[model samples]
Target: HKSEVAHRFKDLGEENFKALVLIAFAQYLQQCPFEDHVKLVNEVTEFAKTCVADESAENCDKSLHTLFGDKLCTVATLRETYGEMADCCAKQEPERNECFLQHKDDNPNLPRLVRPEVDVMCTAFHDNEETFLKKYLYEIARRHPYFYAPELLFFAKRYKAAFTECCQAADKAACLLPKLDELRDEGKASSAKQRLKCASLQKFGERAFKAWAVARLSQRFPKAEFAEVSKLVTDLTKVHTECCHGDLLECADDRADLAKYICENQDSISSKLKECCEKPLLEKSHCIAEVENDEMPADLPSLAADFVESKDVCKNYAEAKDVFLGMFLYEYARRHPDYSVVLLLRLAKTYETTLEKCCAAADPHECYAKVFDEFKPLVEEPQNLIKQNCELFEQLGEYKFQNALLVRYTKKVPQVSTPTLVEVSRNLGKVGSKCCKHPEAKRMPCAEDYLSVVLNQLCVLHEKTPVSDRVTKCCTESLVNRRPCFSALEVDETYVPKEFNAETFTFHADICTLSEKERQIKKQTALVELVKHKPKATKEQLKAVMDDFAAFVEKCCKADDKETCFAEEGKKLVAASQAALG
Candidate 1:
């Protein structure tokens, strides 16, 4: 509707159009309970008028201060908001309004407005329904800034009506619980479907997916002209489908192209889709995925939602099990984006095994239905543990974090080969560096994706000669819960690390003559040797041992008798390491 208003205002010249934009902003804020909203609207309109006549007028800031001063907005917020839109302030006429519209619609980085507790919400609504609904409007709008004014207004009305009935009910709490869930689920479902579409966009190339979009659109709106509809659909699909694949450069560029198109051709697209374009390209795909869609065309057939027909599971398995399993994985993976590809594959394997057994049963449907519940325990602990480890990696920098992983893995599975332990630590560190560097929103998924590779490698490298029964058991466990199983194993009490050899620590006089790189490598080799030999030593103790080795190397290399100096001091280095290792 605001887009419609902007369309109508286009002919009124840039000055009046700018004024209308401000008025639209004021209208969006109409439900505010604090102060006289009428007075606020009037002030905003006047400021718009003044600013249009003289863009440099001091009255703009003064007007904003008066409008929002006692309304509980902070001076910092006022300044930051004003500063962000300052670029729009500098632009000429139509561009200025366009720029302002773009800036206004984008979600700002504000702290989340935590919703009130159920009892607190009902109590507040009962005390003053209008004010509570307005507060609800403000809270919902700020949190979900991509939602346009029309949807917000509808939500506000729905919330008010829902609360009014609930507050009047005998079981207000019970009645309101499911109602709130319904509202949340309604918002989430659209975004979930969008994410699913993006998964398809990646799975099928852009050209193929755009063709699918055209086919779907043509089927839905037969009366629309083919050429015009194709152009519009191309514009829409080109924005996202082209770049939704993992190329950041293409994604960023394509989003900007569509943003210009959306801002320019507002009448061509729905207001809901337009708001998704408002986000900066970094999160634009996410925003677009959240845009609610109208109901599907009646003639359109749905995608396969079930994994298999339980009645003929064996026939399906015997004929085309791979294809069926592939579809099941694709469907499940798209729906649950948080699950890693490896995790999905593990689930697929589990399904395969379950299906194999269930197919032989007299009642396959019942057997499969009951066995499917096994997935709950499989994911529950692993998700929490993976999330926690990623959080720890992010908080602890790579050096400390890798050492921390090393100490825990080494101490717990002391009987594992030193080479295998070193390999695991190295790969896990690599995974941390690769995945934990992602933005917080993406970190866990990235970690989960890569962590599976490391776990799989660990299984491959497991010694044929078992360290302990628990180690063997864990290594043999399914990929999904293997890490957690290993994590739960007891520390080896009787097992001991390889005893150190002083010969590995003894350095040559050539250390002083070698290239800087070669010299460092020589020193590092000795440190790693000590670390491998004393596997039970804490990271700090290892660091101290490293320091001792480096210090002795430095002191001996500078001495008049380099070999003799090393020969004497090297024994002290060995004694010190022996004490440290013990």
Candidate 2:
């Protein structure tokens, strides 16, 4: 019997099916070497997302073969839908545990997939499940690769509601399936064309707003590994679940007007929209009655007026632009998404380098153009970097070179305070080194294995911190403390330099550039000496002594004395360790 056109794409549709492809191929990638595997998965993800939506069995077979030529469109062993949202598993490659051999029917020929953990594996699934659910929503994304394409659009309405409500992985598929079933049942009673168009003014209005939001998030955070970014993703996605609760499609044809109206009028909007839709024979007037933000522009150029007044100049009111996005009267701004002033400040802030050079020029779109063009490769760099070196980093630990590289290219407008520029660089170093270190390495099994642990650590920092502005200020303050601890607050508020002893903390004098690794080694050695001297000495007590010793090492490194410098520092190190025992 022939399978239905839609059924042919089931590899991407079912929950475990994609896991089938993803998990199997991730193992298979081992045969190819790390660099090559990362390349193929990314290529396959991009090519697959677009082609899978066709669901036309013929087109599915044709487009995929055409795109991959002989590459990853199929797998002896790979895939995900919104996998663009995750670091590793966006395409559903759950690490470890005798791969498809376990999940697939009991086949002796199917070999063990290798394994990561029982404990950590159990832990990783919770934080990652949200992205999975979002990926699942694309089950209906059968029309085009895009999340908003016609195949996905209607079903997304139901998914937006269920996503936040579902908690665990096992539960969500069923939790959502019922709502999906109900929506499907209702639709069976209706036609596909009717189902697509049946949105109430309120529902259609809601879709417009959500579409804008989804579009904005996808544009901003597109391929970010959602571990740390999930807090932001949750807060952002929550807007869809809570902001406007409407049932039935509103006027579908005038969706832009409807979305614009919702943005401008948040109060009693459902009622007003209902009145607007029912009473309209607007074909008569050939125009809407004087609606304020009604004529919303679609793309960016339309939003910028001709720079007539000095006040009209974009630079003068940069802060005001931020404040405007700070509180939306509603999403009238998003209806004019690209052209929206609310969007511009973000674009400017995100590409400050570009903005400094081109934003105030003859056209702001110069910055817009530059931003889109540059942002793609920049976003990809980190994602690719993390996966590319998972093995080398697992053994060697993150070399810390990546922070500077990321800072050079990526535009980070801190979404939260906890990820100070220092921490952002710090955490990414730790996480990619740690999280991607899986298939469990010999050296750092504990640090690199679990996803949930990493996310928890990331969110705890981000959630408590202030918004981006506050974050930047807080980081600046931290920078202040870290850079000049001895000069201003400790050794001498007036001396400005600690000649012999550098800053370590509690006793830091700021003279060493041994790199964090060397500094850490010196600190550990010194602390052991301090602790042994007084059996009662606490870590805090040792902290100060180690700091003093670290200060000495800082100055030691600056010496031109070479072997003498090592002898001298080595003596100081030995004396400090022995000083405590004495």
Candidate 3:
């Protein structure tokens, strides 16, 4: 059987490889037990390994690097797809198609949800993030009554680290103690709908807890260093030794409630570490809530990079990928081009002035909190933060496009210069997609460079300022002041409309891209099939949408690092075609 798989895979053509690979998973899933998938998956995996990395080939290194150096995208494509198809057997128990999974079915229900816990389901199969969330629920909630929040499937997707930090190999019901414990006292059993709104107002959440605790401790001992107040928590344990024995302080319930019990009999405990030489000045402050006790910088601790350093940082709140809040403005500009340049131009300048005015004062938090008040709502939604930041900074997306569907320009072409705008926008889309390396904010334009910096590398005279390396005008500048500098250059006569590079070309494509021929066939076939389906589709409208599809793909699709077979565009065209046909 091993030999047979090897030979068949070696002989498989590119087309067969493509078709079988796509449908092998998500097939007849409920019809059969997943255990039945093992034998065939091993076969497909063996074959796929041979297809890409057969060690027997002599020129494999050069051949692989050729594949490598061509598209940086190729690496992620194979790594991810290889991981996906490594399983998902081709056999029959997999016959389901194109429908959605039920919200609450055999899947378990987590009731009252005393706390986060783990069951064998997380480890039963080494499923990825998607399955990781579903399994946890089925294992725990299956016993309890649950709700039909199927979208909760996506919950673990965002709350990944929370699950891992809390549930992984947990001894306690809530596996995650230290990290999850912070919000535990305030957040109880079930808060999904009435859930604790994650705080963006500085010191409203975790910071609030710490600030309040320290202040209370500071009042108790008029001369204790507020920082040393943290020691009182551990002091509760010493009271345990006294309660456990008569001499060494012993009692029967010593292990359970002794610490809380002993903490009350203040006469029994001791705390004379005066020789520790604690700083006296620290005693002067009400509460060292912040490091120096300076009204704590406006930065909400959770919004900092090191807030929760388990999986990755989710710090899109206070700073915009280490830039200004104007990142919000920039991202909105990209998605809504009707208000692009002016909006972005204004935002960056506003923050530049604020950072200067506020940060210079003895209490920057005062200035920042006031200036950023309009934008604090920016961090109000944790999930949406990255999407907006992703759009603003233009980093490759997190496999999810949030705030915007990616940048695209509509044909509202300003009534002036009609013919030129379309051609300019089209080429701009192509060139921008090719050059812009990121879909997230970290990688695209920085606040320092977006507004003041001017590019004179253009034709058609215009009003503008000059730059050596940075932007000059803040958004405060008028269009006349902010317009880009330019000197028109005539088109070279030799640059006449020319034929394509007539040289022969090899069959090369992004590993993420389909074989051009296969791709063309499928795109056309999908359109043809749409016309034949249900209410049917109109020829003229289909044609118009086809043009829209091209423009759409040119603007948004190609820009994304992840490749799609017009997944979104197709759904839209189908609906448009159906409406027109009716």
Candidate 4:
């Protein structure tokens, strides 16, 4: 058996030791029986241990000499052989991989296995075995000078074989590089469309970073950041221009130039590194500190640093500004209809400025509505103040008229007392009778113009150098009386026109049909009676009565005509008016 043959060299001379070790290892690698492997490994391990223990023999063979140290040299080699055997066992039965994996810390003699520095090295080796072996060989060659001696040529040969194996593994891994490059290119081509499908804008950063990293590497670091962010922006602009102008050709030299530029500008790279990596780490640390120290104020730098690190705060700030602008503009339009257009333009400009600034930092559309909701009240304060000051409408009469119209159209009953149904009905009858007397009354301007004039005069009166109390009182009283006066005028019977005089009839029937001088006197007398008591109406019931009378008068005047003569029209008008009052 191979084990028996290898054990025969247990007491062999130093000259035959290396040869015997190699022959035994070669046979063991050919799936020799497990018992034979154990026997051969034990024999070699004991022989090597004795060689290391004997100081005189340690100086003789260079390979054994260098392996001598604080720990037994044979144990180290035996451990490595054991690990290799375990790997082989795991490969033979895949289920045994866990068995080997669990024994990673099983080697009690090698404290280096668990040491921080050596553990890091071990992890790196486990992740990338070829690199680990290459580094291992280089380190062994550099550190073990005695092993390089001509007498230890066999050991050097074995190191060369291990290096060859490591190189072959590296070659196989390198074959995947091109495929990764192709995949990266495909990913970039689809990124824009992919971004459109994603609902959240936060994901854009990660997606953009991937494409950016790939593009940078492909173009030999063409995406290097400049001294200032502005310069970086300019370079990006140049890239865009080149792309748009179709001047982009795959130039390896240009890529190399970019790489050289990146390599040369260490400070710029550091800045990029700080922005992308160090700043985030620092922000996170600050946030943790703030959370730990809960007494910190939010506006303080410490708290601000923590807030910046918080995803929620960043998202809120990003969205609030635009939302504020939108709501403020809408409220301005609603409150001040007269100045809505001008205010809208101003608001739009402000929104544009804010959007531009936000977009410069990041996307504006993403955060516009959110930010507006948070800051809308502050943004709209000035407009609200202007509304409260009555700066929108200068004249008191105009304001009252508008207020009255709003009350009517909006179905809002005025606070002022209303007239009795009988009074309202009588006023409606008079209004209808007046319209019948003068068919052209419908064309006459309503009291709205008169009210506007009175209001303008009041405003002018108030602005005079010397205040005229009489003028102020008179205007105020007139404004208050106008509604009720108009109402009372409707109910006065004296305003009714007299009947035609048949006694004055002549051959010229058209001329005879006209009212006699006495009838004209009667009509004039009626108008006088109507207007006489108009000013005496009570303020409490005046507004409602006047409003009702005005509406009745307006409707009768509109319907009146000589052709559609209805002598009893006043009765129907009165009944309709009474119903409205009730």
Candidate 5:
């Protein structure tokens, strides 16, 4: 196939397609002068404006490339467009006058490409004078709300103030809805342009109303339901306009009632609004609302008067006491110079009292000793001294002495037991040696005397026995009272009557009548007959009966029939008998 073009650029490979297009476009653009370039740029812009209407234009990937090239070309085109206008002004030719007249006549429909240059020139010249440029400035401000730092009301006020100015500065008919629609059809209304004109108006209206309501409510009530207050302002605006038409009165009474209602219920309404706003929008359960309502207690008045009054007060006081005690212990160890025995004893006693109070509230069987043991180390040098003393007191079996020591040291009431005098004397000797370094010493208001008083009292309540008869009397009394007792003596007995079954004896004698070898021969004969009859039986059933017969013979008859015992000969006899029968 012969190509018409020498280069055949259109048939280039995919890898070279973009390079070929760029080279061709560059050559075309470079050949044109600035004026022709500006004309070509305008033509291309018009082409783009028309192309956007054709949804199929996007089917060509090259359309995007063309649009990007046109955008870049417009920048250069803008310079040329302004340069031509400047040349017209400078030369003042008759054709220049004609060009200016033509420009004036077609001002309303200037090429969209020339509009940016015109705006830049106008803004540069009238940058400051509000009267000369209010429409342009306000339009710019309205288009870029994010750039305008003034209060929303200021922008809103400016929008309203410049409305008439905008109408006058531009061609009134051109600015009207019909002409605007024509511009939109011409692709002059980009998304940004449409947003500037339409969305800005809507946004300004909403911002103005919100700002005005906030300002009015802030002055009147200072604190009001924001949503309700906004509605009030909106309704007031509608009512004010209606009143002028003689449609209705302003409803001052209704306004007063609303204001009073807001004043009284503001907290409740605000709380509700906050809860509503914070609630999860995607939640599926209506029960959440009911649960929130249910969280509030019903019939709070039924609670005790003292409990209601003292709850927080008592809780706060207890918390403060615990905090103080924690700090005091820390500070005492840090600040105290001398290790005073008295102070140690006092601290131990306080801790013991605290433990007692906690224990009283807890079960005795489940009493935790860690907190009590915390003070044990502080009261004595050797850590085990307190534990040892406490344990020795417990084992002494002197109820009064143990109870007194526990109450004095740990401040706990203990279960009591009476101790014998000998036991009390033994505990006193041990306590004196351990605490006072005195052994076999005479008692001086000692633990033993306390034990003696407790034991004597118990003895008086119970019947007393002499020391010699004490063990025997105690045992005899326990036996007479049917209390638990143990004895190790054994006795012999004689039997007078025989208690054997005569039927069992007769059966054994009849079995013994057969000689041992004769018995074995008979048993083997019976087994052979049984096997012969079992030919139709299943293998498992026959094996079960064989096992039963073997077990019975081995256990009952084998030892007695030792000379011709079934134990050794039973297997051979059974095999021979079964084989012969088969």
Candidate 6:
């Protein structure tokens, strides 16, 4: 009997359970407009006593509905985990409390927890901080019964901090809105982690991937009809497969199709998902990734625990290696969503080799199950560096990005002639112009492969000239480690570039009158020379100064007194660059 009571508390999840009860009390006071605190407390206490006796969420709902009429049912309908909530009630107090506390409803099918805009919320807080905060907690708690009390408190703390910091600012909307966006991004990132897991599961092949998707989707959208759920699985499988296949236009096309499908069926999907339908093709897909998963249906099978059909992995591999490994990877990917596909592929190979060695040896099962954690010491650095390079390319576009690389290399490897550095940077920039356009899943690899061709050409070119020591060492480093090595190379601090004084900044009308190719050449020359001189200037600062100078030259070329204009503005430009570079 004692254990039964404890189990009930555990099943019900004490933190979430009590939080919901408090929310009900708060909502009741707001609805009924209590004049006396003691009277309100007595009424809520009586309501609590009633729930203690009646454990069914139906009974819980009955009490709340009776107290508040249909006022509470609006948010109550969104609580999809009620079945488990009711099941927890079937147990005694302590166990039931524990069950409710640990309940997690992080399904992607669920709509986003809608909140008032920061402007509105901040104004409300300013009106009455205590009441607004209480209502805020209650609003979140009622809609998300799956959240534990501490989690709600943590969110509340963040909300309070945001308001505290932003409400006092002159541009409250500007200050508060970006802060809210940050919270939204962080929240979306957490949910997108699971969606990314489903994406990686695409590599497990169609049948197995579809099966997993069906089970997962069915559980996530418990209220949806089987026909809709099945259709969703088909669509999701197609989207996941093609999107992860590493083609830019193809992935975008498929993701657009999925966005259209979900948006068209907004009646069945979450409101937040429907909102994405109004966005552009790529943005719609991004919006969908941010939506949280819904509460899973009761009685769904655990794919990870129950998936394996055979004891001998060797036999499984020999007969249906694709299916077996796919199933294994599905389970593995879901458990480790953050792990890169590169690492996962390596893990699969490791598992395969383990089976190969153990299958022939004595104690095959034991040996196969033993440690195969012998991952290479480094895995992420090169890929991350490659990703950074591609991101820079994307941010700066082709022309400026080429110029950026030229400046970078010219400053770092001042020993190398600017002409060679210019040539290499231009080649790398061309690779980026094409490769950075690939789908995110393929961007780094595309950049890496093509960028290496350019690097190889440079290294081979320098065989006669013999570039700097760092360049040679980096070129000779292992392929996987070489990019980061180049990234980390020290700048040639001792190399003093020629002065970029008024003479350098001052330009004749020839700067504007020159052919387009000649103008570009001049720009590149100026960039390399300035970077060499102002070695401490950041890419952004240098970009700003150069752009200003370019603008001045363009307008100065149009002036009747072109020579006087260039002379005057050139001195001002030189002075400004000196201040900015400092």
Tens-place lDDT per residue, model 5, 98-130, is: 342232111122222222333443454345443
TM-score of each: 0.37, 0.23, 0.19, 0.15, 0.13, 0.36
Compared with the true structure, what per-residue lDDT tens digits does model 2 show for residues 1-582?
Answer: 132222323423433323222333332232333334445545545444554565443434442212322343343333442122122222332232123212322111333333334334334435575344433432222121111122233344455565455434465555655665566544332332222222221333533333334334322322322232233334433433332221101122233343444334433222223334433232111122222222222353422242222234355336554323222212223332223222333333344455445645777554445344554453343334445557455554564334332232122231222124344444456556545634532222222222223323333355465444433343334211211221122111121211222222222323255556555444433332232224344445444554565556656566664555555565666566445533
Order of candidate numbers by lDDT, starting with the best: 6, 1, 2, 5, 4, 3
User: Residue 321 in candidate 5 has what lDDT?
Assistant: 47
TM-score of 3: 0.19
lDDT of 2 at 381: 39
How do the residues 1-582 of candidate 6 rate in per-residue lDDT, one tens digit apiece? 222222323433444334334554432222223223234434444554555565442335442223332322223422452444444444554454345434434331434557777678778898998667655666554454333233345466677899999989998877887777767544433334334444336434576456555445543454455567668878887776654433223454576678788888877855445556776543566666555444433454543233332365667666876556555544444343233434444455566566667767877656755434443333455456657877898788888888878877887887777578777887777887876677665554455545555666576678678958888987766443455577787678887765666555557777778976678767777777677678878878987897898788877887776577777788788888888898
* TM-score of candidate 5 on Cα atoms, chains taken together: 0.13
- Candidate-wise lDDT, in order: 0.56, 0.35, 0.32, 0.33, 0.33, 0.58
lDDT of 6 at 446: 53
The RMSD (Cα, Å) of candidate 2 is 22.8
Taking the tens digit of each residue's C-alpha lDDT, what string does model 1 give over 464-574? 555566767776664445556776876666665566575777777888899764674455445455655676677688778777877887877776785877777877878
Q: Name model 3 segments beyond 4 Å from true.
A: 1-369, 374-410, 439-442, 446-582
Q: What is the TM-score (0 to 1) of candidate 2?
A: 0.23
What lDDT does model 2 reach? 0.35
Per-residue lDDT value at 64 in model 3 = 21
Residue 175, model 2: Cα distance from true site in angstroms:
40
Model 3 Cα lDDT, one tens digit per residue, 1-582: 223323334544433332232223212122222333333344445445564555453333332212212222223333343343213222122121101111113323224445423454335323575344433433332332221122222232334565555455636344545444533321212222111112111214332233223333333332333224445433323332332221110221232233333234323222322222132221211111111211221332232222222122222333343323323332223232222233343444454566566555665555555443543442233224334543543463321111011111111111112123333333333333332454433222222122222121111112133221112221223331333221112222222222222111111224226654455433443332332232122335545655765565555445653334345544554456445655
Which ten residues in a row are the worst by lDDT in model 3? 402-411
Any runs in candidate 2 off by more than 4 Å, and if so which? 1-23, 28-100, 103-514, 525-535, 538-544
